[PDB]
Design a protein around this motif. Structure first.
Motif, PDB file in Angstrom:
ATOM      1  N   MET A 159     -48.929  -1.328 -46.048  1.00 10.04           N
ATOM      2  CA  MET A 159     -48.521  -2.716 -46.301  1.00 10.04           C
ATOM      3  C   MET A 159     -48.627  -3.522 -44.844  1.00 10.04           C
ATOM      4  N   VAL A 160     -47.861  -2.865 -43.862  1.00  8.35           N
ATOM      5  CA  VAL A 160     -47.700  -3.560 -42.710  1.00  8.35           C
ATOM      6  C   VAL A 160     -49.073  -3.584 -41.830  1.00  8.35           C
ATOM      7  N   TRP A 161     -49.907  -2.750 -42.072  1.00  7.39           N
ATOM      8  CA  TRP A 161     -51.446  -3.053 -41.543  1.00  7.39           C
ATOM      9  C   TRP A 161     -52.045  -4.247 -42.217  1.00  7.39           C
ATOM     10  N   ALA A 162     -51.980  -4.242 -43.612  1.00  5.89           N
ATOM     11  CA  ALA A 162     -52.607  -5.157 -44.320  1.00  5.89           C
ATOM     12  C   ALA A 162     -52.136  -6.563 -44.145  1.00  5.89           C
ATOM     13  N   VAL A 163     -50.639  -6.683 -43.793  1.00  4.66           N
ATOM     14  CA  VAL A 163     -50.160  -7.983 -43.471  1.00  4.66           C
ATOM     15  C   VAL A 163     -50.476  -8.423 -42.151  1.00  4.66           C
ATOM     16  N   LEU A 164     -50.509  -7.459 -40.972  1.00  5.38           N
ATOM     17  CA  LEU A 164     -50.788  -7.706 -39.514  1.00  5.38           C
ATOM     18  C   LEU A 164     -52.265  -8.084 -39.364  1.00  5.38           C
ATOM     19  N   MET A 165     -53.267  -7.681 -40.468  1.00  2.00           N
ATOM     20  CA  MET A 165     -54.743  -7.931 -40.257  1.00  2.00           C
ATOM     21  C   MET A 165     -55.139  -8.984 -41.149  1.00  2.00           C
ATOM     22  N   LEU A 210     -42.700 -11.655 -41.071  1.00  4.61           N
ATOM     23  CA  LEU A 210     -43.715 -11.249 -40.151  1.00  4.61           C
ATOM     24  C   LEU A 210     -44.840 -12.395 -40.378  1.00  4.61           C
ATOM     25  N   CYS A 211     -45.180 -12.995 -41.523  1.00  2.00           N
ATOM     26  CA  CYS A 211     -45.996 -13.893 -41.577  1.00  2.00           C
ATOM     27  C   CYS A 211     -45.637 -15.085 -41.161  1.00  2.00           C
TER      28      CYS A 211
END
Lengths: 262, 223, 101, 337, 62
Positions: free
Chosen positions: B138-144, B170-171
């Motif tokens: 999920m962190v990877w999906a949000v950051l990309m 983060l967003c």
């Protein structure tokens, strides 16, 4: 070998999680010998798993071969079985291993949990030696991850997911069946001798359900129709095998050469 | 070993339906995910455009070699920068740094003397298995900037409320950073929409938990 | 929203009024040479797994309720009825066209 | 035919006895009647902060102002020693970098380590910042040290029992420095830059030309890896520091050790060794947390600089010769003057 | 037979010895004048005070 197996205490019991499946599911299992007395198993199912006594019991004897039913027939069968076991608190007794009609029952449960609430106590009774991962289930009272992916080259059958409770039977062998039918029948007969909550004096009704199957299916159905508490059976004409043969023979009740199907 | 590569291909190209199909067809994220898979997912080139390059440029000083590979320590640093003052991600912790030290460096048995680290390679198949893979996914999906992948990965695993709140923060931080760095002014709108959606999901989950039981819901917010 | 800030900044504060707070400043000097509630709560493994099961059950119920609510609106029913009516009309026209007598 | 196998000793033994006959008046029995200098202790003057991780190497420049330094976090920083302000901070691709050097005129800098590559940075770009300029490859083992002679020619030391004089523009090398059976760590260049030395895990040193690189002289006698070596400013001698708690000094013509260090308080190896601008004051860091400064001609411990929390890693000397910088593993860097 | 490795052995051994090694007395007669004439040239023997020292301490007396 003349069943020269050492009688040691069991060391496999508890909960597992089916990692890799579509739904994260929890099931509780033990491992007992094939000469286990049904009363202690009933006590284990009643108190250690917090299960109440059912109002109905369904047996799903079928064929242990990966046979595919045509559409608009397996969907109706699955939904009917799920509805009949959901409206009435009932114990579905299946083989448990992911083979044959048990896979169809598992898929029928798969299409139910995604849309509706409630749980079905689908008790599976499977021989111990056929599971794909004989190890990894030795953890006692501790959750153990289980790999649902099955490679056919291992010559073994994995446990089917979407089941709630397992009862694994062993006789010392591995890779062969034949260590659960007597235990299953004894447990069914002991359940049928138990008393439901009503003070009429009536026992728990028992029915049997047949889909496809080989020549042993005729033996078990003739054993069912013989017993002093005789139970009815239900067959499906859309399967193709001896169940469909029995359905065709159900017609013109009281051409003996047409059975030479090779 | 074929479904693993198929899952990797589906993850890189942002095809959520194929990922769901493969997850429903046997493969598991616990066995599949590892350090190499994650560190190659963070350095993919396919898929929609992301603002990670500018974030890593802004962190670790304004200069950077051009053909640079982003490792997990850089991801930990940028996550800590985005989150807040006292936040401390797991990647930058000494345990993970020492574990990641065994990816390169012992190539020369005489080199470990020169490096002189103060430091156990457990028999775990590789002790390179992320305990809760869906958190890092999920962190990877949000950051990309892949909203559908993040929304799919959110509902699995544990700690749904914590994941939702972290994603919202983060967003919001990424939206502010991209707005300050004279972007096309639409990336800010997309990131703000993602933040609002994640916040709404967190609020709705809290509402459901309070409606179900008071005591467990009260314990969830404070533990 | 600011009630939490008020509570936190008062829980941090020492336990004496400002006229008497100077004696707490000296006591801090002695502590220089040498959150069970209020901020957090530390639980055991059984409670943690119970909380995990509870939150997974809650999110599953939330998704099920949301999908069921969406499937039972008026607009969705109208759309599905229109699609099936079109398909059935085309099929019935095809059946009526193909006649053997 | 194995006659070359049995011909090794006679050629070896003739040189072996040749060095024995040269001992008639050693260093100690000659420097006995020179000026006694006593004990001189230094103090910390300027400190360098900004690197969160431990430093690994450094090298002074002609102006004795700007210092390169590669840290364990893969970051490079220059240091204006007058104010210790941050001037040029540079990142690295890998977290494990070991080599850094200063240009003869402050033009180009390079990095190395376990990366198995040699990258050259252009400080004098036309864009205002520092970007990658050239690249070298071929050293299969870990790069240990690299030094600059000019903006066209560079030399390096590597752990694959080999070294090479590389051509910067085309990327190839000229001469491959072969013969060591161990990992070559550091090299020391003569002031005229004609003949220079080596050192590897063979407990021996080899003399190399800057043009052809013939295997000139061998300086054996140690018991461990030849870690750090520094050249005498006359270009006719150099010192060999190893991890066996001893350090040896050799010269060019005599092919024999000049003098040893008579101090058994040194129980660990020597990390770095550096000569004075004249060859009188010796500086050395060790595995322990004490910096035993030494005298080169009186063979005396010149001083102790115990002001580092962790191990001392790299050592530097000013060209003008008033301050000494010591790079340690405490993420600091201090100026001793 | 496989003497290629020892062919490299005898080449350097007969080229290494082609030099003259001075006695250590002569070696102790070479660098003493070199060091003494550079002893005053090197401040590492004669510590220069805070005047020439580029590392001098700043004093802003205003």
């Amino acid at each position: 070998i003349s069943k020269h197996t050492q009688l040691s205490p069991t060391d496999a019991f508890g909960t597992i999680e089916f990692q890799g499946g579509g739904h994260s599911n929890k099931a509780m299992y033990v491992r007992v010998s094939f000469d286990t007395k049904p009363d202690l198993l009933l006590h284990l199912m009643t108190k250690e798993w917090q299960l109440e006594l059912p109002k109905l019991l369904i047996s799903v004897h079928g064929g242990l071969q990966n046979f595919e039913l045509q559409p608009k027939l397996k969907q109706v069968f699955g939904k009917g079985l799920i509805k009949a076991a959901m409206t009435t608190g009932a114990w579905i007794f299946t083989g448990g291993v992911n083979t044959g009609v048990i896979r169809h029952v598992g898929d029928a449960l798969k299409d139910h949990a995604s849309k509706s609430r409630g749980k079905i106590c689908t008790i599976g009774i499977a021989p111990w030696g056929i599971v794909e991962n004989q190890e990894d289930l030795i953890g006692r009272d501790v959750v153990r991850p289980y790999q649902t992916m099955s490679n056919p080259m291992s010559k073994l059958t994995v446990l089917n997911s979407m089941h709630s409770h397992f009862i694994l039977a062993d006789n010392g062998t591995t890779g062969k069946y034949g260590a659960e039918v007597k235990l299953r029948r004894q447990l069914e007969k002991h359940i049928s001798l138990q008393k439901i909550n009503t003070r009429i004096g009536q026992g728990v009704p028992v029915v049997a359900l047949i889909v496809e199957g080989g020549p042993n299916v005729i033996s078990i159905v003739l054993e069912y129709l013989r017993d002093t508490p005789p139970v009815p059976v239900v067959v499906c004409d859309g399967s193709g095998r001896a169940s469909d043969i029995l359905a065709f023979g159900h017609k013109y009740s009281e051409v003996t050469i047409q059975k030479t199907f090779t | 070993g074929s479904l693993e590569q198929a899952m990797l291909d589906a993850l890189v190209l942002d095809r959520v339906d194929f990922v769901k199909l493969l997850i429903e067809n046997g493969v598991s994220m616990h066995r599949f995910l590892t350090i190499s898979r994650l560190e190659e997912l963070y350095n993919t080139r396919h898929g929609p455009s992301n603002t990670l390059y500018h974030l890593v440029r802004d962190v670790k000083k304004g200069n950077l070699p051009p053909d640079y590979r982003i490792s997990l320590i850089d991801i930990g640093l940028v996550i800590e920068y985005l989150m807040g003052g006292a936040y401390r991600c797991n990647y930058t912790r000494k345990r993970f740094r020492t574990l990641y030290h065994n990816l390169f460096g012992p190539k020369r048995p005489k080199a470990l003397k020169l490096l002189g680290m103060e430091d156990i390679d457990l028999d775990d198949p590789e002790i390179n298995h992320f305990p809760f893979p869906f958190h890092e996914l999920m962190v990877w999906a949000v950051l990309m900037k892949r909203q559908k992948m993040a929304l799919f990965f959110w509902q699995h695993g544990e700690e749904a409320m914590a994941k939702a709140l972290v994603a919202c923060k983060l967003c919001k931080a990424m939206a502010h950073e991209a707005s300050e760095n004279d972007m096309v002014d639409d990336i800010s709108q997309e990131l703000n929409h993602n933040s609002r959606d994640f916040g709404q999901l967190a609020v709705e989950l809290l509402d459901q938990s309070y409606k179900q039981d008071e005591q467990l819901a009260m314990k969830l917010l404070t533990y | 929203f600011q009630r939490y800030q008020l509570i936190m900044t008062f829980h941090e504060r020492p336990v004496l009024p400002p006229p008497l707070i100077i004696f707490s400043h000296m006591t801090m000097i002695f502590q220089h040479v040498c959150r069970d509630y209020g901020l957090k709560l530390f639980i055991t493994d059984d409670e943690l797994k119970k909380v995990h099961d509870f939150e997974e059950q809650c999110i599953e119920e939330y998704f099920r309720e949301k999908d069921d609510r969406f499937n039972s609106s008026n607009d969705e029913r109208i759309r599905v009825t229109s699609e099936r009516v079109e398909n059935m009309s085309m099929r019935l026209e095809e059946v009526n066209e193909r006649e053997h007598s | 035919l194995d006659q070359l196998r049995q011909e090794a000793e006679q050629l070896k033994n003739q040189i072996r006895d040749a060095r024995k006959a040269c001992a008639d008046a050693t260093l100690s029995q000659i420097t006995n009647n020179i000026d006694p200098v006593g004990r001189i202790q230094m103090r910390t003057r300027r400190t360098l902060r900004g690197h969160l991780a431990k430093i690994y190497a450094m090298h002074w420049g002609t102006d004795s102002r700007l210092l390169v330094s590669a840290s364990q976090d893969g970051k490079l920083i220059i240091w204006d020693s007058y104010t210790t302000n941050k001037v040029h901070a540079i990142p690295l691709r890998s977290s494990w970098v070991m080599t850094c050097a200063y240009a003869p005129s402050g033009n180009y800098v390079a990095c190395g380590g376990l990366d198995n590559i040699c990258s050259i940075y252009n400080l004098k770009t036309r864009e205002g910042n520092v970007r990658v300029s050239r690249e070298l490859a071929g050293h299969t083992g870990y790069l240990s040290c690299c030094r600059f002679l000019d903006d066209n020619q560079i030399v390096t030391s590597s752990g694959d029992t080999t070294c090479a004089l590389w051509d910067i523009e085309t990327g190839q090398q000229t001469t491959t420095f072969t013969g060591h059976t161990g990992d070559v760590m550091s090299l020391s260049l003569a002031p005229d830059t004609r003949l220079f030395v080596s050192g590897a895990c063979d407990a021996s040193a080899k003399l190399w030309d800057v043009r052809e690189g013939m295997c000139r002289q061998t300086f054996t006698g140690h018991e461990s890896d030849i870690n750090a070596i520094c050249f005498f400013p006359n270009g006719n001698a150099f010192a060999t520091g190893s991890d066996d708690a001893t350090c040896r000094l050799f010269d060019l013509r005599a092919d024999q050790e000049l003098m040893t260090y008579s101090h058994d308080n040194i129980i660990c190896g020597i990390t770095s060794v550096s000569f004075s601008k004249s060859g009188r004051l010796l500086l050395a860091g060790y595995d322990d947390f004490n910096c035993n400064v030494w005298d080169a001609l009186k063979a005396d411990r010149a001083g102790v600089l115990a002001g580092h929390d962790n191990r001392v890693s790299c050592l530097g000397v000013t060209d003008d010769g008033m301050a000494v910088a010591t790079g340690s593993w405490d993420s600091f860097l201090k100026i001793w003057n | 037979a496989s003497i290629a490795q020892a062919r490299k052995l005898v080449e350097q051994l007969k080229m290494e010895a082609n030099i003259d090694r001075i006695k250590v007395s002569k070696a102790a007669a070479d660098l003493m004048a070199y060091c003494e004439a550079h002893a005053k040239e090197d401040p590492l023997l004669t510590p220069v005070p805070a005047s020439e020292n580029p590392f001098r301490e700043k004093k802003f007396f205003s």
